[PDB]
Amino acid sequence: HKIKGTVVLMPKNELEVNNLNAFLGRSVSLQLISATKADAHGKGKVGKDTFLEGINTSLPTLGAGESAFNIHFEWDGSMGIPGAFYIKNYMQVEFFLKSLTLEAISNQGTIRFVCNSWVYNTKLYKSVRIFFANHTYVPSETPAPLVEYREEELKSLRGNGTGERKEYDRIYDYDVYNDLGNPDKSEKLARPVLGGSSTFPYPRRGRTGRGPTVTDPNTEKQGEVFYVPRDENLGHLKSKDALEIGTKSLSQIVQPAFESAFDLKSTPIEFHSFQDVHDLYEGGIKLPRDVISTIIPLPVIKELYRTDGQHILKFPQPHVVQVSQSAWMTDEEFAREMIAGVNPCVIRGLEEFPPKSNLDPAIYGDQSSKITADSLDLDGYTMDEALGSRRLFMLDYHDIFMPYVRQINQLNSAKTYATRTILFLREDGTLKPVAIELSLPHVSQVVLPAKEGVESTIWLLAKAYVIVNDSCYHQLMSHWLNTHAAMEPFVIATHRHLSVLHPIYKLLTPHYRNNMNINALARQSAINANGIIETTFLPSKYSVEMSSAVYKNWVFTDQALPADLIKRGVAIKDPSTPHGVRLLIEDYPYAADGLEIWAAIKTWVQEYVPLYYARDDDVKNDSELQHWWKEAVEKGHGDLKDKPWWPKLQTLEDLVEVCLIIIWIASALHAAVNFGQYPYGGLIMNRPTASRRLLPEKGTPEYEEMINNHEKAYLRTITSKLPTLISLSVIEIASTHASDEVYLGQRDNPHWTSDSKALQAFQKFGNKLKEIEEKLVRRNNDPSLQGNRLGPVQLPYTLLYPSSEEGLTFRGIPNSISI
Ligand SMILES: [Fe+3]
C-alpha cells in the first residue's frame, strides 16, 4: 500500500533578482496527515518521514523554473485519507514549494495541495510547516482530526506582538506609521506619528519590530530591509518584473546621480521653453558619461529609458501627446480629464450657489466663495436654469488645502493656492470650465476663461494651480490613502484570522498579491522623510500628514462605486436602470465603464458566497469570519472603530457588500487611478506636481515676463527640471504592467479549490469580463461618445479594459494593488 506523489518546487536561484541532485537523499522530508483517523488526542494521525526519491523529467505541465520530484508514501489501512502534510527542509538553502499531488486509482480521487510558499531550513521554524489539501471548509465543516491543526497554524501566523521580524518569519501583525521619519540622522527629518490618535488617525501597516530610535522612543529605527511576511514577497523569474524594487534604486542611486549633474552645471537647471520638455521623449536629455554609466547597469531602471550608452537618456512618448502636441492646453481637455483622466473621482455636483466652506470662520474668516453667478458664461442658461437642470459641477479643493496653505507657502520653494473650479455641462454633453477661484488664508481672486492677451496666460496659470492641487490629492489620497494604505489592514487581518481552508480566504487573497510588499518598499523609499514623494510633490514634509487629515473623513461603505457617485452628486438613485443609478453626466467614462466592472464583480461574489453560507445564521456563527472582521475594524482601522457606518457582518447581504468593496478597491479602483499616471502625466505641463510661486503682481518684471514669454512664466511656476526627471521615472514604473501580473478573472493556479461549483462560477466571471471588454471597445468607437471618451488628445479611454499585455499599456485591471 503505497501512494504515489509528485512534488513541484522552484529552487532559490530561479526567483532571485540579484543543483537539483542536492534535493535527493535525506534532504527533504514530507509526512502525510490523516483527515479521517485521529490519535488519542483527536488530532489526525501522522505518517512516516518520507524523502524525495528522484527527479521527474517527463512531466509536460511544468512551467519555467519548476522541477518535479517523485515520492512514494507508505500508508496502510489504519491511516485513513490524507488531508494535510508536514514538510521539513534539512538543506541550508530555502526553496519555493509549489504543489504536492497524490495519485489515485481514479483521476477523480487525485488529492491536490496548492502551497506556493517558501520553505526555509527546519531549524529556523518554531513549528513544522504544514500544508492543507485544496478542500474548502468553513470552520464548522472542518473534519474533526484537522481542527487543531487549522487552529494552531492561525496562531503561528499571529505571533505574540513582540520581537524583531526576520526574513523567514510568516508573522502578520499591526503597527502605526512611525517608521517614516529619520530623527537619528537629522532633527529636520523628524515626522509625526500617523495613527493611534484622534489628531493623526491612520490605517495600520504591517508590524516590523525593529525597535526605537535613540533620539525618539516612539519612532522606529531605520533598517536596510523593511520586513514583510515571507510569502508576501514571492519573487519573479525575470529581473525586469521586479518593478517594486525601482523606487529604492531611484531614491538611493539615480536621484544622487541626477543631482550631481545639476550641481556641476552639466545641463541647464531649468526648462526654458515647452520644447525643452518635449525634447525629453524626442531627442532625449544629454547627461555626463559617468551619470549614464551609473544608471544603465541597474535592473528595472535600465528599462525606463532608451540610451546611446554615452550621453543620451530618452523617455517614452506619453500617450497624451501621441496625436496632438498641444491639445493638453485646451479647456476642453482640462475638463475632460476630471471624468476620464488619471484622477476621475473627485468632481461633485453643485446644488446651491455660491459654494460654501465649512472652515471655522474664527480661524479662516469668511470663506464664502467670491464667484458671482452673473460673471459666468453658461451658454445662455441662467444660474437658476443650470442648477435646476443639474448642469453645474465643481472640483473643490478649498477646504482640503486651506488648512495647510500657510505652512506650505513658508517653504522656500513652494507656493500654492487653495482652488475651486466651476464646470458647466454643455448641451453637447461635454464639460466647460467657467471659473477658477484662487484662495489664500489671512486673499482671493476669481479668474475667468480668456483666449487672448495677458488674461489668457493668467487663465493658463490658474489651471496649473488647480492641477497642482489635483495632482497632490490624486497621489496622496485617491491613490496612496484610498487603495495602498486602506487595503493593508484587511490583508493582515485575513491571514491572521481566516484559515487557508476558509472560503472567504480563497475569495479575497488573490486581490492582495504584492500589496504589503510594495507598501513596505514605499515606506522605505517613497513616502519617507526626504523620499521620492516629499522631494517631487508640493507639500514636501507635510505630504503624508495631509493624507491623515483626509482619512478623518474616509468612509468604507462610500468606497462602493454607486455610493460614491450618489454621494458626489454626479448620479441619482434610479431603480429603472440596470445598475440602479442614473448618471447626471451620462457619458462619464470612468463611471460608465466602472459600473460594468462593478456589476460583474457583484455577480461573482453573489454566486460564490451562497455556496458556503445558506442563511444569515451561517455568517453569524462563523467564528473565523467574526474574528476577522472585528480585528480589521477595531485594530486595522482602529482609529475609526467607533464610526456608525461599519457593517456589522450579521447577514449574507453584509458579507457580500464587504467582499465586493474590498475586491473593487484592490482591482478596478486602483487600476483606474494608477495606470494612467505616465500616459497623462508623462508630460509635466499637463500634470504638474508642484507650484513654486504665486501669480505675478502688475508692474513687476515677473508680470512683464508673463506678457512677453508665456512658456517661461508657466515653467517658472511648475515643477523644476530636476524633480521632473525623478517624478517621471517613478510614474513610468507605476504605469507598467509586469509580465507576471495576474489580472481580474485570472488566478495563479486552476486548482485553488476542489469545489467544482466555485470553479464554474469563476469561469462565468471570466467570460463576463471578456464580454464587457467588447462592450467598452464599442464605446470607444462610438462617434457620439468621442467628446468625452477621446477628447482633443484623441486618446481612447481604455483604463478599465480588463485585459492587457505586459508593459506601459494604459489598459488592464490587475487583481490587486501590485505596483
Ligand atoms: Fe499603486
UniProtKB/Swiss-Prot annotation:
One GO CC term on file: cytoplasm
Catalyzed reactions per annotation: (9Z,12Z)-octadecadienoate + O2 = (13S)-hydroperoxy-(9Z,11E)-octadecadienoate; (9Z,12Z,15Z)-octadecatrienoate + O2 = (13S)-hydroperoxy-(9Z,11E,15Z)-octadecatrienoate; (4Z,7Z,10Z,13Z,16Z,19Z)-docosahexaenoate + O2 = (17S)-hydroperoxy-(4Z,7Z,10Z,13Z,15E,19Z)-docosahexaenoate; (4Z,7Z,10Z,13Z,16Z)-docosapentaenoate + O2 = (17S)-hydroperoxy-(4Z,7Z,10Z,13Z,15E)-docosapentaenoate
Cofactor note: Binds 1 Fe cation per subunit. Iron is tightly bound.
Effect of residue 522 to T/V: Complete loss of activity
Gene Ontology terms, MF aspect: iron ion binding; linoleate 13S-lipoxygenase activity; linolenate 9R-lipoxygenase activity; oxidoreductase activity, acting on single donors with incorporation of molecular oxygen, incorporation of two atoms of oxygen
Region annotation (Disordered) ranges: 200-222
Keyword list, A-Z: Cytoplasm, Dioxygenase, Fatty acid biosynthesis, Fatty acid metabolism, Iron, Lipid biosynthesis, Lipid metabolism, Metal-binding, Oxidoreductase, Oxylipin biosynthesis
Binding site for Fe cation: 479, 484, 670, 674, 819
Cross-referenced Pfam families: Lipoxygenase, PLAT
Stated consequence of mutating residue 511 to Q: 20% of wild-type activity
GO process terms (BP): fatty acid biosynthetic process; fatty acid oxidation; lipid oxidation; oxylipin biosynthetic process
Enzyme kind, highest EC tier: oxidoreductase
Keyword Lipid biosynthesis found: yes
Entry-linked InterPro entries: LipOase, LipOase_C, LipOase_C_sf, LipOase_CS, LipOase_Fe_BS, LipOase_plant, Lipoxy_PLAT/LH2, Lipoxygenase_dom_3
The protein's annotated pathway: Lipid metabolism; oxylipin biosynthesis
SUPFAM superfamilies, per database record: Lipase/lipooxygenase domain (PLAT/LH2 domain), Lipoxigenase
Lipoxygenase domain segment(s): 136-819
Subunit note: Monomer.
Family named by the database record: Belongs to the lipoxygenase family.
Functional description taken from the UniProt entry: Plant lipoxygenase may be involved in a number of diverse aspects of plant physiology including growth and development, pest resistance, and senescence or responses to wounding. At pH above 8.5, only (9Z,11E,13S)-13-hydroperoxyoctadeca-9,11-dienoate is produced, but as the pH decreases, the proportion of (9S)-hydroperoxide increases linearly until at pH 6.0 it represents about 25 % of the products.
Protein name: Seed linoleate 13S-lipoxygenase-1
Organism: Glycine max
